[PDB]
Amino acid sequence: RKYFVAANWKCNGTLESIKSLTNSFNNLDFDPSKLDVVVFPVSVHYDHTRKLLQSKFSTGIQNVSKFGNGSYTGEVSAEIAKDLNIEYVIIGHFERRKYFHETDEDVREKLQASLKNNLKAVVCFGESLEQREQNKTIEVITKQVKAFVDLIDNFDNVILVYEPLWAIGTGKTATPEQAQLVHKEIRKIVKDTCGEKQANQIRILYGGSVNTENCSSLIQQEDIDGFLVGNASLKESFVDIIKSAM
Amino acid sequence: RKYFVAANWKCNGTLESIKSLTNSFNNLDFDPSKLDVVVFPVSVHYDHTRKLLQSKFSTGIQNVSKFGNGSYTGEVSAEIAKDLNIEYVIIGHFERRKYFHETDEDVREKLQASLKNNLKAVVCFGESLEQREQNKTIEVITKQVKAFVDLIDNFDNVILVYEPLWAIGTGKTATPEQAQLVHKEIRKIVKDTCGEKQANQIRILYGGSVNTENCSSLIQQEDIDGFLVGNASLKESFVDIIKSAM
After folding, report:
1. What share of chain B is helix, strand, coil (3-state, %, to 5)?
2. Fewer CB within 10 Å of terminal CB in chain B, N or C?
3. Binding site, annotated residues of B for D-glyceraldehyde 3-phosphate
């Protein structure tokens, strides 16, 4: 399957810092028909970023509404995103589940809205440190995936992201062994509930303190198809992470 | 006085599990001149642990011999510990008094040997459930402390640990009120036998099923200066217990 590398800039950037960063990104020579590279800038930065980035790079937004067009002040609907030809959306990111009270119900409704409007979605899930120490990792992960897996119709348009909460922006990356185990179990869940062909074509990425030093060993794992990169994507060295996947 | 938090790994660990654990511990940003944090790995794990742990963490061993260098197969003398620059030693832990037949006499001789070799010691004592139900708590505790208190010359180098036997690894922690009462009586014993200045500078920790949920309320007590943590110290969440003391 095609490897996938996503840059989640989260809530960072200025018009100038983005110009400098996109410049470095554009210098990397890579074939978009062999590797997917998506950049997710802040909403108000979308037009600026899409313009500066070369067409080989795909772009998207960090969140989308579970509602349609209407009286929902502050939200961006899937219909609006499609009108702008925004290709991807991130759904269920830990930070939205944590600081904001997004639940599995919100995740499934947002995915349904996205697929309905032909948007490609990057869906995140993962267990907290407390759940891991209680050995509930697989139980929690299974519940989270089952909350929306039946909605997936085209397995090339939905990308799964295993995000252990304890590894997000902390510097404590999951070891290749740890991640591989979880990814293998996730694909088995998909295989058994959706089908083997489907399971083998869906990308399952790892997210959580991925950097230029550990990316190579992680992507080498049989069931890790790429990554969702946070803080490391705000640096010019991010290009080396992309290189590890080509 | 400076709070003190001790991680007693007891008889647990593998080279790999220690690498993962020390990694999480190293991520906690804390000032060692404001808080003492000591880790006690198994003897054969000492070098490995000392190397992996950052210098902000102090280390020690779980037991020391009451004899000096010589024909005592299986023992580690205080002289040997000092040669290795091992900073702390635990003395009189319930498990050594119980499974092994260490008595108050052994506790005092081991402390004398430790202080003689400039080692800092964490001395444990506490009453059994049977003694508590007979209302002999203070009587038993007083006898145990009096067995070695005259040997203390530097009150910053000896740390006392009130370990109610019924609270060790059982999950039944002493309530803040219970512990506070006992700690207050212990400090009064020291005050009256050694002096007020001495009594006010010596750390008296509580040990017995301390976890991330109850640590805050315990450390808040006026005479509880920290803890000796067992099972909860084998988990990455141990960092939250350290946080409660900073």
Report:
1. 45, 15, 40
2. N
3. 8, 10, 169, 228, 230-231
